[PDB]
Structure 1
Amino acid sequence: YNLICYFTNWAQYRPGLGSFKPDDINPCLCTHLIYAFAGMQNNEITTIEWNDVTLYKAFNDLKNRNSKLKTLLAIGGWNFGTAPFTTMVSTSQNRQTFITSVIKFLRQYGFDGLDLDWEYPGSRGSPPQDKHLFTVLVKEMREAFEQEAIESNRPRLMVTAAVAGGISNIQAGYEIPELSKYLDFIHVMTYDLHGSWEGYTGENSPLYKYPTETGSNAYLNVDYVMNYWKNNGAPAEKLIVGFPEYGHTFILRNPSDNGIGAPTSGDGPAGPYTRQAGFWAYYEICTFLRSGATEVWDASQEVPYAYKANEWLGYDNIKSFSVKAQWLKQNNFGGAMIWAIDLDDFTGSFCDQGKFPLTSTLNKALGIS
């Protein structure tokens, strides 16, 4: 099994104990580390932070402590949008220019591959032709990587992609049978399945549907999403299950109505380190649990939730990570990916569960070390 761990280049700016840079990573936890994010300019891959070159070096220097580790650079992300991707894939010339820039950039800075994080082909302004042109881009990139390996006598660069977990986005975005032939791994974003945007409480990454859900609400679970990818053409061994090391928060409209599906208002509370309404890192969750919160096991969905007065949290813990890890092995998936290692209790100072408790749980369950 593989354990793919995302690192984010803005975690460095969090205050105090939240500040996280590549030297905070334990290099033996994961099989692959992915650096989020690179950008694009003039159809070529580029940096986005003033000190990315420094952080790239610290990141790829982690391979000096773990000889089996591979690193990848992710391009895109949510806030990147779709416009640069649409322009880049629109012509063979623009695609060859991008691919050429990627080979040079990855080799120069010491990366072993590229993770495509276009959110999403065919959605968010991307026109319908981008579904097929994404396949063309990946096929051409895979072919170019194969040839560069022969020419340079080095192991081939990997091409992977982070892909939608929402069914409407999947249907608009991906030619799954053909795309799956050329990708090395498919990182399915089986999280953000519920959140304050819905107006009621729900779990960030429930394994199974809630018993009362019918129709399109029943898409919103790990089991459905992973099996959608598998049964529409993706090989199980290339499919990587997304594991969030964070939870989504809500403000309850009536604190006495605090179950799954209880009505909510607004964007949800923010945490002192991540400072974004609706989102708490696992280490911030541990502080909440120590602040008088009630913890509940959502038995049908195999995940926890917790509440305190008007605040409600849907999240993941060691138990739910363990259940889902057993599940993915039983379904013959390729492994797990975590968003994001800088949201784990990397200092060990918040959760009393050791350093990197969630990532360590997957390391152990998947036999990585």
Structure 2
Amino acid sequence: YQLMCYYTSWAKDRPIEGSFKPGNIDPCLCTHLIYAFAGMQNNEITYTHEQDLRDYEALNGLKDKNTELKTLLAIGGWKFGPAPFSAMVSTPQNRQIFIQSVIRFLRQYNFDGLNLDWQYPGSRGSPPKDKHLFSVLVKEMRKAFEEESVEKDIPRLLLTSTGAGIIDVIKSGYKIPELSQSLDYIQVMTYDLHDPKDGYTGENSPLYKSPYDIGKSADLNVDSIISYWKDHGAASEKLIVGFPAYGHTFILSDPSKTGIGAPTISTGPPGKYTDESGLLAYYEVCTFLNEGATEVWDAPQEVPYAYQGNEWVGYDNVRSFKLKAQWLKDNNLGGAVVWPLDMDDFSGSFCHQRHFPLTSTLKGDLNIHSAS
């Protein structure tokens, strides 16, 4: 199995004790490390900020301590949006320019591969044709990586891609049979399945359906999502399950109702270090628990959730990860991806359970392999 881990670029911009630098990561903890996000300019891959080139050098410099470790560069993301991709895949000319720049760029900075993260190739403003086009880009990109590897004579560069965790998004933007043929891996976004927008309390990455999940919500769970992918042509070995190191905060309209499906008003207040609304890193949830937040286990969905006053949090802990890692033996080889690493108690300061409690669990249960 593979233990992939995301390293956010804006993580080192958090308050000192909440700041995570690329060289602070354990080289033997993951099998694949993915870099926050790269940018695009003139249908050419490029960095987001000059500071980045220094993160690349430090990120790949870990391959000295762990020779089997592989690093990938991710382009895309939610903020990025579909617009730039739609325009880059529009013509074979633009396509060939991106692909070559991705090769030059990746080979120059010592990356072993590229992670495409086109947030939804068929929705959010992307036309239906992009479902077909996205497929073309992959087949084309896979082929050049292949030629480059033959002529230059070096291990081929990996090509992965994220995949929707929402049925209706998968149907309009992903050609799974063809895609599962050209990609090396598919990181499935099995998280954010419920958010304060829904209007009720829900869970971030539930393993199973909730006795309250009705209609399309019945599929809003790891088990159902993975099965849809598998049933539509995706190879189990190539599927990589999403493991979030954070939770989502809601605000109960009645502190009397603190269970799943409880009526909500809005997202929760920003956390001390991760400054957003609606979220809380794993280590930030530990403080919440430590300050008297009533912790309860969701048996039907196999995940935890806690609450304080009118503050509700749906997250994941070591127990939910272990339970999820055992389920992962659905020949769901390949394995899991931690999203994001910097949101795990990397220092042991907040959750007094040593470094990377969540990732350490996945690593042990997936028996991560490394002659080091």
TM-score by length of 1: 0.99
Q: For the Cα contact (< 8 Å) 1:9–1:49, is it kept in 2?
A: no
The CA deviation at 1:199 is: 1.1
Q: For the Cα contact (< 8 Å) 1:11–1:21, is it kept in 2?
A: yes
Q: For the Cα contact (< 8 Å) 1:241–1:333, is it kept in 2?
A: no
Aligned to 1:273: 273
Question: 2:119, 2:275 → 1: CA distance?
Answer: 23
Alignment RMSD (CA, Å) = 0.8
Aligned to 2:16: 16
Question: 2:212, 2:243 → 1: CA distance?
Answer: 24
Q: For the Cα contact (< 8 Å) 2:270–2:277, is it kept in 1?
A: yes
Structure 2's unaligned 5+ residue stretches are none
Deviations 1:254-287 (Å, cap 9, x if unpaired)? Answer: 0010000111112222210001100000000100
The CA deviation at 1:167 is: 1.0
Aligned to 1:333: 333
Give yes or no for the alignment of 1:291 onto 2:291: yes
Query: SS state of the match for residue 297, structure 2?
Result: strand
Deviations 1:85-122 (Å, cap 9, x if unpaired)? Answer: 00100111111100000000000001000000000101
> Superposition pairs for residues 120-139 of structure 1, below 5 Å?
120-139=120-139
The CA deviation at 1:219 is: 1.2
The aligned length equals: 369
Query: SS state of the match for residue 6, structure 2?
Result: strand
Q: For the Cα contact (< 8 Å) 2:240–2:332, is it kept in 1?
A: no
Question: 1:193, 1:341 → 2: CA distance?
Answer: 19
Aligned to 1:263: 263
The CA deviation at 1:331 is: 4.3
Deviates more, 1:212-221 or 1:186-195: 212-221
Deviations 1:196-223 (Å, cap 9, x if unpaired)? Answer: 1111101100000002323201010000
Query: SS state of the match for residue 79, structure 1?
Result: coil
Aligned to 1:206: 206
Give yes or no for the alignment of 1:309 onto 2:303: no
Question: 1:193, 1:184 → 2: CA distance?
Answer: 25
Identity, % of aligned positions? 67
Give yes or no for the alignment of 1:195 onto 2:229: no
> Superposition pairs for residues 41-80 of structure 1, below 5 Å?
41-80=41-80
Query: SS state of the match for residue 39, structure 1?
Result: strand
Give yes or no for the alignment of 1:219 onto 2:219: yes
Aligned to 1:171: 171
Deviations 1:289-324 (Å, cap 9, x if unpaired)? Answer: 001100100000000000011100000000000000
Question: 1:77, 1:366 → 2: CA distance?
Answer: 27
Q: For the Cα contact (< 8 Å) 1:201–1:312, is it kept in 2?
A: yes
Question: 2:168, 2:217 → 1: CA distance?
Answer: 12
> Superposition pairs for residues 330-369 of structure 1, below 5 Å?
330-369=330-369
The verdict on how the C-alpha distance between 1:180 and 1:330 changes in structure 2, with shifts beyond 3 A counting, is: closer
Question: 1:239, 1:24 → 2: CA distance?
Answer: 28
The CA deviation at 1:75 is: 0.1
Structure 1's unaligned 5+ residue stretches are none
Question: 2:330, 2:45 → 1: CA distance?
Answer: 38
Aligned to 1:106: 106
The CA deviation at 1:36 is: 1.3
Question: 1:151, 1:284 → 2: CA distance?
Answer: 49
> Aligned letter for 2:106?
L
Question: 1:283, 1:212 → 2: CA distance?
Answer: 29
Query: SS state of the match for residue 115, structure 1?
Result: strand
